[PDB]
């Protein structure tokens, strides 16, 4: 039963590693995302201030 008990628990670990690997992926996505959603706030704030200069 050597090759059934070791084989099954090890496969469990191969699944366990894959879930951890998805959450690492998730975290990389959130870094790229962060630069992206900060870019959309600057250039809308930029033109708001440019609005009130043009009003002036």
């Amino acid at each position: 039963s050597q090759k059934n008990g070791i084989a099954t628990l090890l496969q469990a670990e191969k699944e366990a590693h894959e879930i951890v690997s998805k959450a690492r992926k998730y975290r990389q996505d959130k870094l790229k995302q962060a630069k992206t959603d900060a870019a959309k706030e600057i250039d809308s704030y930029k033109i708001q201030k440019d609005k009130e200069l043009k009003e002036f």
């Binding site: 099954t8 469990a12 670990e13 959450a23 995302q33 900060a38 704030y45």
Partner: protein, 52 residues
């Protein structure tokens, strides 16, 4: 070994393997939300002062 001792460890260990998988992925993606905010705020506030 006997047949019960063999199943007793198999159920207990595979529980742990799952518990440790869940615990590590959940902590890493918990940190992913936090870290997103730090960086989005940081990039904005530095460059908003530059706009001002």
């Amino acid at each position: 070994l006997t047949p019960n001792q063999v199943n007793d460890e198999l159920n207990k260990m595979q529980a742990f393997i799952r518990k440790e998988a869940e615990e590590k992925a959940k902590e890493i993606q918990l940190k992913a939300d936090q870290e997103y905010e730090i960086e989005k705020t940081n990039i904005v506030r530095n460059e908003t002062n530059n706009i001002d």
